[PDB]
Amino acid sequence: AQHAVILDQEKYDRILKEVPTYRYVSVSVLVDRLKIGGSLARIALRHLEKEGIIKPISKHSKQAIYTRAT
Amino acid sequence: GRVRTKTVKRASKALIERYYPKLTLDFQTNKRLCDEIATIQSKRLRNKIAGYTTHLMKRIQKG
Amino acid sequence: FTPVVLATPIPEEVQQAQTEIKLFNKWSFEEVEVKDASLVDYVQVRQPIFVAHTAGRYANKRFRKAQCPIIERLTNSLMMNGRNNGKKLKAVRIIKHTLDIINVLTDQNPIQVVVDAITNTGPREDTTRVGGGGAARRQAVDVSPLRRVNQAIALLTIGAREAAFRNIKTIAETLAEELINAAKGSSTSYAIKKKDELERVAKSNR
Amino acid sequence: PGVSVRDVAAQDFINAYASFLQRQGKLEVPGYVDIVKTSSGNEMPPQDAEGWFYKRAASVARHIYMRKQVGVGKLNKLYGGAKSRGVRPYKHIDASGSINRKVLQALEKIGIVEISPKGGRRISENGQRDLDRIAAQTLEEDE
Amino acid sequence: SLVVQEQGSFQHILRLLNTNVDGNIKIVYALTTIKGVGRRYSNLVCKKADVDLHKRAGELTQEELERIVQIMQNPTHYKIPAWFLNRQNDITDGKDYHTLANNVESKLRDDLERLKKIRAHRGIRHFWGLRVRGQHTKTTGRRRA
Amino acid sequence: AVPSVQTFGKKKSATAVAHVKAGKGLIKVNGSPITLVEPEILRFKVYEPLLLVGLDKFSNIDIRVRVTGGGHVSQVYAIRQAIAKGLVAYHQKYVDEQSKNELKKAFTSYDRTLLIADSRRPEPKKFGGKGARSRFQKSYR
Amino acid sequence: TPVTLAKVIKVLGRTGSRGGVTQVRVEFLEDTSRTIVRNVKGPVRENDILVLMESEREARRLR
Amino acid sequence: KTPNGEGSKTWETYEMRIHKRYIDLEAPVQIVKRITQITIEPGVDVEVVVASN
Amino acid sequence: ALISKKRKLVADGVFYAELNEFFTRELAEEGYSGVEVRVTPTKTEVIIRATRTQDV
RNA sequence: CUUAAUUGCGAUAACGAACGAGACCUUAACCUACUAAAUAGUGGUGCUAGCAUUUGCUGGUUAUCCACUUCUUAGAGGGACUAUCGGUUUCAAGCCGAUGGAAGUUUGAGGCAAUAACAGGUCUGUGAUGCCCUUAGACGUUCUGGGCCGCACGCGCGCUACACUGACGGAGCCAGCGAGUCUAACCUUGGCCGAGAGGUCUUGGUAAUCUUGUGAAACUCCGUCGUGCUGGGGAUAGAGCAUUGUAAUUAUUGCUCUUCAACGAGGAAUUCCUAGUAAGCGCAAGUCAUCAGCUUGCGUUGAUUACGUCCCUGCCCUUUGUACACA
RNA sequence: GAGGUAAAAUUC
Ligand SMILES: [Mg+2]
Ligand SMILES: [Mg+2]
Ligand SMILES: [Mg+2]
Ligand SMILES: [Mg+2]
Ligand SMILES: [Mg+2]
Ligand SMILES: [Mg+2]
Ligand SMILES: [Mg+2]
Ligand SMILES: [Mg+2]
Ligand SMILES: [Mg+2]
Ligand SMILES: [Mg+2]
Ligand SMILES: [Mg+2]
Ligand SMILES: [Mg+2]
Ligand SMILES: [Mg+2]
Ligand SMILES: [Mg+2]
Ligand SMILES: [Mg+2]
Ligand SMILES: [Mg+2]
Ligand SMILES: [Mg+2]
Ligand SMILES: [Mg+2]
Ligand SMILES: [Mg+2]
Ligand SMILES: [Mg+2]
Ligand SMILES: [Mg+2]
Ligand SMILES: [Mg+2]
Ligand SMILES: [Mg+2]
Ligand SMILES: [Mg+2]
Ligand SMILES: [Mg+2]
Ligand SMILES: [Mg+2]
Ligand SMILES: [Mg+2]
Ligand SMILES: [Mg+2]
Ligand SMILES: [Mg+2]
Ligand SMILES: [Mg+2]
Ligand SMILES: [Mg+2]
Ligand SMILES: [Mg+2]
Ligand SMILES: [Mg+2]
Ligand SMILES: [Mg+2]
């Protein structure tokens, strides 16, 4: 299975819709379900954390835990 | 697990048969008295003799 | 909790909940019981622990193995297969994220799931190999309540390692997937399947 | 209220001291930066690729103040690591000597480090002025 | 950081120096598929042409691809201190030359040709396809392929 | 003079000398406070004589602990032994005995080797094996 | 399937070829006047509540 | 433990324990010439060194 | 001079071991039984402890 | 019957003894007590630097000036003896459980270790040696060169790996057992030069002093990497810079660039191990002018699973069978 | 006064 490391306009709209629907999001969640690369999935977490869509309850270098906005 | 040897039971038989006065069933008065009245080379075998005389002084007043 | 000023700065998150009742960093060691049989001195809870790291002497005595906390025993079983012998600070961190993933999905008090994972993944009857000669026949014998704790921790850390092998999902992610499926057994994990397979063979051998 | 560098944590101080000297500009690079491995036991150059000379210099300037005096050979044994030598297992290899000297030559013209007597290098009165002022700025930001 | 949103002008596998380049990966490994240069040489060229290492292959403007080739064809004039090249003190003219894609296959043959025509022991061992760096061939080397 | 007691806590090779002198209640480990323990996981192990005994209980004395020898886990279990042993020392010679047994029974049901040393020592290595009990391997033919 | 609990009141000893099966006389919790000897596998102390898959099964000696 | 190479690989260890003392004595030189000819003992080294400068 | 004590005390044992075999081979016909050495300044004493000292 | 034990309690044509076991010794653990320490440390007083300034906090400085021995060192000693208590066997030897205690598996681990025996190994440890051979164009000795490293193939002990519990880049920074130069060139601090390897100028230490706090690795943090024989793997091969040595070609070895293969958890079989042990990890020492990937010690991180049985391999004690005694 | 139990295994 190929993973897209470069975003598309039709793929960028899919990220803003399906991520706050999810209960648990992480690095392994975005690679397996949204079919993006592992190096690209780390950058997308900081893009959603800065805007305030996802909420970190625990931050670590190896494992990243993020929940939805309450 | 642990069984005493014969030389512990040999010296303990020699103590009880002649030192029934000046010794009671307490260990601490059976330990510091063997420092002078007997010539034991090491502390470890000395405590094993006094640990076995104390075991036998308990079962004299019983039977 | 009657706060007071002090020279070295200890934060508010430490002095508030850790001085009134003996809970975790900011988590729960609350009134969670067992939904199975009693299992006397097999569940550690009351008395609780601070973290999963402990240098106790629980392996010297045959009886005091059940006195070890099961949160520590999950760090102990994630500490094998070669390169991971030692490195317990890696193993406590995996359990630290394992309780975080459980705490999200329907808010799911995480100490309830770990205790229920032990009671719903233990094979209730085992088989032993004795007699026969040449072509030996297996005999189905009962199992101790100690080994039902011992096999539950083994079947939830080996299958969480093979599911996290050669894929994007990490160790603490697949381990939480094993424990949530262990609460409601639907043959969707490793230990729920291997519990049922060891009992459907034990039926033909008794 | 009184503050020192030991009251400040290990890596928040380094990430703030190296960020403060980035704005000052007084760096005095020799010129063989960005092409060096900075060790004889590593495998790749550092991944920062723009700067990263302040990052070791922030670690050295704190390493001197917490001790009596250190030299070049002390910064080579600590900052080194195990070398991936190949089919036979690892061995402790000291770090590069030329990197650890030019940091102590760049911090000397500023006034932070000084040539200590009886060997080694100690901290100066300007080093205790600068490294203790911004150490207060780390704790005041987080409260 | 930031995700690019301009258009579908992303350019994968495209070839330079007649050997193919692995597309849609980090730009520091675009050059590593070339036989003759390595990971250390690919990182040095991408730091001299003002190329961001936090990107993929990406856009690959034609003004940027020509500067990468210009460094690789003239390494001794573009701030390389000559201890980094692979072929130093050459047997042809004594200069410092850096091998290329289809060049390292030809120069390795020329390094084996000048040793077989002089009957030296460093070259005759390559004629039977054996080990030349002087180790025990008692147990190891039993595959031939 | 000022009231000053001193104790020690011992793991395998890590000793933690804890001078408990008078002051206004500061806890420093090698000049750095107790909030800066080198493992982030094992930081709550040295907090265990800071939670069970009471919130502060430090109205008159300071804590100053230094480390000699050990590792990264062996020194964490030495400084938390030095505080619990260095607390019952001050509550003996100055504070009355009746309030010290409240501290002793507190670290009795939760024993966890705080007011008692760990006598487990590494076994010496014998010949033939890379470890103490182990052996390399043997081949029959 | 039904579940049946049983409390350990007496233990006999090890019985088997390799020595891993213990003869344990368990007493049911739903019937305090009836007991059945069962063969178990792991470490069993007294007063332990076990889970029996088959209620009625008499244990024999393994050879 | 073996002189040849045959047998089980049994190793053999030895040890020699060296004990050392030093005593500072602010003494006149008259008792120095007496303390050297007295308290002699085989296997014991006696050293007299110059002062702090 | 100037020998470390981890080597001088070892060399004193070699000095005793070297004189063990020579006073065994030379004093074989005189009933040799072992020697002891006593080092003192200005006079080093080596005691020859044998059975028959008139032949020695 | 009871133990690790021919251990003992006892039973008895045997009674009293000699060996082994045990004892003893060494080491690791405990003592806020003893004798003491500028070659081991702390507290206080002076001088002095920085931060807050209301008294503080963190450091520096060697005969300023005194006190102390808690750690560390080790002389003499103390201390568990299965002690106390509750059960169990007919009492008795002993076992099991709890409490106390630094420690209750023989306290943990070693050293020593009988009788009888082997056609076990070493004549290549020996100026320990019988006999035989050789004794000068020498199977004495010495110098130059080569070999012991050659190789379609089989086996044994080990090392690195088949990664995302990981590689890679910064940063956190933690030990013990050790070893080191006299009529010389050992361990090396510090300052310069060099990408590295290293080079150079000096200094400390014949050693609890200096190297050395061997600020070692695994590890911990912060990032990159995202499953693709990839950035896992570093074999093979080219070119160059240096060190050791009279001499390195068959690359001694170190370093830098480049080459970047097999290997996707290993068939039949088989080895080691029960607690601070297994495993992971590095250091020191031995051999050493130079080189371990070996070995002898040591420390750091530290499990899972038994507390049993004689099923397999095999060992002790009796009873019995034998046509075996080269068993 | 009652209390488990059979594979194959040849020669020097
Ligand atoms: Mg298992
Ligand atoms: Mg497993
Ligand atoms: Mg993955
Ligand atoms: Mg340089
Ligand atoms: Mg191209
Ligand atoms: Mg890269
Ligand atoms: Mg050939
Ligand atoms: Mg070959
Ligand atoms: Mg080679
Ligand atoms: Mg305890
Ligand atoms: Mg060891
Ligand atoms: Mg072997
Ligand atoms: Mg002894
Ligand atoms: Mg003392
Ligand atoms: Mg024998
Ligand atoms: Mg031999
Ligand atoms: Mg030989
Ligand atoms: Mg010989
Ligand atoms: Mg002739
Ligand atoms: Mg002739
Ligand atoms: Mg002639
Ligand atoms: Mg010649
Ligand atoms: Mg040769
Ligand atoms: Mg990765
Ligand atoms: Mg790392
Ligand atoms: Mg650190
Ligand atoms: Mg000198
Ligand atoms: Mg020392
Ligand atoms: Mg350190
Ligand atoms: Mg760390
Ligand atoms: Mg085999
Ligand atoms: Mg080594
Ligand atoms: Mg060596
Ligand atoms: Mg056993």
Residue numbers in the entry:
A (entry chain Z2): 36 to 105
B (entry chain R2): 2 to 64
C (entry chain F2): 20 to 225
D (entry chain T2): 2 to 144
E (entry chain S2): 2 to 146
F (entry chain Q2): 3 to 143
G (entry chain c2): 5 to 67
H (entry chain U2): 69 to 121
Which lines from the publication concern this structure?
Crucial for the recognition step are the conserved protein factors Dom34 (Pelota in mammals) and the translational eukaryotic elongation factor 1A (eEF1A)-like GTPase Hbs1. Dom34, similar to eRF1, can be structurally divided into the amino-terminal domain (N), a middle domain (M) and the carboxy-terminal domain (C), which appear highly similar between both homologues. Hbs1 consists of a unique N-terminal domain of ∼160 amino acids, followed by Domain G and the β-barrel domains 2 and 3, which are highly similar to eRF3 and eEF1a. Similar to termination, where the stop codon is decoded by the eRF1·eRF3·GTP ternary complex, stalled ribosomes on non stop or no-go mRNAs are recognized by the Dom34·Hbs1·GTP ternary complex.
Here we present a cryo-EM structure of the Dom34·Hbs1·GMPPNP complex bound to the yeast 80S ribosome programmed with a nonstop mRNA at 3.3 Å resolution. We first programmed purified 80S ribosomes from Saccharomyces cerevisiae with a short model mRNA and bound acetylated AcPhe-tRNAPhe from yeast to an unique UUC codon preceding two nucleotides from the 3′-end of the mRNA. The ribosome is in the non-rotated conformation with a classical P/P-site bound tRNA. Similar to the previous intermediate-resolution cryo-EM analysis of a stem-loop stalled NGD complex, Dom34 occupies the A-site region forming mainly contacts to the 40S subunit and the core of Hbs1 is bound in the GTPase-associated centre between the ribosomal 40S and 60S subunits. As the A-site is free of mRNA, our complex indeed represents a nonstop stalled ribosome that is derived in vivo from the translation of stop-codon-less mRNAs26. Strikingly, Dom34 adopts the role of the mRNA in promotion of base flipping by embedding A1756 between Tyr113 and Lys44 of domain N. In addition, Dom34 interacts with h18, another integral part of the decoding centre. G577 (G530 in E. Coli and G626 in higher eukaryotes), usually stacking with the +6 nucleotide of the mRNA during decoding or +7 during eukaryotic stop codon recognition, is stacking with Phe47 of the β-loop of Dom34. Superposition with mRNA from native translating polysomes suggests that this β-loop mimics mRNA from position +5 (the second nucleotide of the A-site codon) until position +9. Assuming that activation of translational GTPases is mediated by tight interactions with the SRL28, it appears that our structure closely resembles the GTPase activated state of Hbs1 during ribosomal rescue. The ternary complex of Dom34·Hbs1·GTP has a dual sensor for the absence of mRNA: Dom34 probes A-site occupancy, whereas part of the N-terminal domain of Hbs1 probes upstream of the mRNA entry channel on the back of the 40S subunit.
